[PDB]
């Protein structure tokens, strides 16, 4: 938990292990107050949102492909909290 959270600050900022302290406290607080998901778990809602977004930009070809790739992510059977990851990518577009 802690180590991963720290490594993230370290990596994106491109600064070393004890140089991330101030951000490290901000993330721990933001994470600490809203640690767990507050919204229902439902993969389907996110896939539809990601597909409306492509529709919205008329990048429909990238949308069609995105469905193939999402199906591929599911079929491999490796992840379990697929929704969260996809929601995190979508939020970051």
């Amino acid at each position: 938990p802690n180590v991963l959270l720290q490594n993230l600050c370290c990596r994106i900022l491109g600064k070393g292990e004890a140089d991330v302290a101030q951000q490290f406290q901000y993330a721990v607080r933001v994470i600490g107050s809203n640690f767990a998901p507050t919204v229902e778990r439902d993969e389907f809602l996110v896939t539809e949102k990601i597909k409306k977004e492509f529709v919205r930009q008329r990048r429909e070809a990238d949308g069609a492909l995105f469905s193939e790739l999402h199906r591929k992510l599911q079929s491999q059977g490796v992840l379990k909290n697929r929704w969260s990851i996809l929601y995190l990518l979508l939020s970051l577009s």
Binding site: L8, Y26, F35, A36, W83, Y87, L92
Partner: peptide
């Protein structure tokens, strides 16, 4: 590398909303 880290956290049941919020501030 950032994505691997993001995935490992999400898989531990982390709130993606909160997480996106941190990531934007970090960028």
């Amino acid at each position: 590398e950032t994505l691997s880290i993001c995935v490992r956290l999400c898989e531990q049941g982390i709130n993606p909303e909160a997480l996106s919020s941190v990531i934007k501030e970090l960028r």
